[PDB]
Design a protein around this ligand. Structure first.
Ligand SMILES: COc1ccc(CSc2nnc(-c3ccc4c(c3)OCO4)o2)cc1F
Length: 340
């Protein structure tokens, strides 16, 4: 609150050269499995920041911090600084970009009010999620907890930022990974099947679940348990052929038309995008970069596009080489003539 805290914090991206950082108006805003999250105001600039505090084992490196020190993207909450603090024990503190809203909260307001999120926002929010994934997947980093709670929004600018890398991991082919991750509703089928050799494509399934959820006003796959979740998917997508099961798993509903799950007025390209994300076969799913280049997002590339409030859209085309690395020719679609 009124107390001024001064710490010696290390720049998130820069050289390892610690600075004194003073912050104030400190309040907890989240306290869960993720740790404790604080809102605070930087003394010098008057800028709000979030501070994530997690217990550290000290005999071990923090994975989340390793990942965050690598990332610099407009659709990912930035690590401004990190520092350590003591109790008695030892905590690591991530000083992060503050973002006021979440997709969860926003979808819930619309749902509660019996309304749907306007399609322009669905395009904006989904696109920026895919850019963020294209970016992190380019390092072989899989978020592994893509869900509406982890999508932060600035409603005034329509900026979406991916947050919570506490479940993120660099996926190395041949190194086994845990299957019971992601939030249930958003959890890929291969995970429910127990695959330990999964790829970044689990994030893409999750994004599809988010997109489907923004279109419907409720989770598309609301599993009752970790096991009932597979049933919920089958109910919507129909039984996987044995070929698909082989694709998902290292060891009786039919095809349910995609244009009937959603409401009658849902844009067909949104349904078409959805169908390419929610494929049983992990490698059949679009890459995030491919998802960005999908027709559903064409309006975002229209030179006349504006937010509902008249403002320009936020950064949409400032693609780096790193972001483009999975399919560089896609730059021809992604970056429209006027943006060059
Ligand atoms: C406020 O909503 C939450 C969302 C996710 C989490 C999980 S851990 C985390 N990692 N970065 C964050 C983070 C970064 C910037 C933020 C933020 C949270 O809230 C406002 O600006 O939170 C905790 C939360 F409390």
């Amino acid at each position: 609150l009124s107390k001024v805290t001064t710490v010696v914090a290390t720049p998130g991206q820069g050289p390892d050269r610690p600075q004194e950082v003073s912050y104030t108006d400190t309040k907890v805003i989240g306290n869960g499995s993720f740790g404790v999250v604080y809102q605070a105001k930087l003394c010098d600039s008057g800028e709000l920041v979030a501070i994530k505090k997690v217990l550290q084992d000290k005999r071990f490196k923090n994975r989340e911090l390793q990942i965050m020190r690598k990332l610099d993207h407009c659709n990912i909450v930035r690590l401004r600084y990190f520092f350590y603090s003591s109790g008695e024990e030892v905590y690591l503190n991530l000083v992060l970009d503050y973002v006021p809203e979440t997709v969860y909260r926003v979808a819930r307001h619309y749902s509660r009010a019996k309304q749907t999120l306007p399609v322009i926002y669905v395009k904006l929010y989904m696109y920026q999620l895919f850019r963020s994934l294209a970016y992190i997947h380019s390092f072989g980093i899989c978020h592994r907890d893509i869900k509406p709670q982890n999508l932060l929004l600035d409603p005034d600018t329509a900026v979406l930022k991916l947050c919570d890398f506490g479940s993120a991991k660099q996926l190395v082919r041949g190194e086994p990974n845990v299957s019971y991750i992601c939030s249930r509703y958003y959890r890929a089928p291969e995970l429910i099947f127990g695959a330990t050799d999964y790829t970044s494509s689990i994030d893409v399934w999750s994004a599809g679940c988010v997109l489907a959820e923004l279109l419907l006003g409720q989770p598309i796959f609301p599993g009752d348990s970790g096991v009932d979740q597979l049933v919920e998917i089958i109910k919507v997508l129909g039984t996987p052929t044995r070929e698909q099961i082989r694709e998902m798993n290292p060891n009786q509903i039919k095809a349910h038309p995609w244009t009937k799950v959603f409401r009658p007025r849902t844009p067909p390209e949104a349904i078409a995008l959805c169908s390419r994300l929610l494929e049983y076969t992990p490698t059949a799913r679009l890459t995030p970069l491919e998802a960005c280049a999908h027709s559903f997002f064409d309006e975002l590339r229209d030179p006349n596009v504006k937010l509902p409030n008249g403002r320009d859209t936020p950064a949409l085309f400032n693609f780096t080489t790193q972001e483009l690395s999975s399919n560089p020719p896609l730059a021809t679609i992604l970056i429209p003539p006027h943006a060059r």
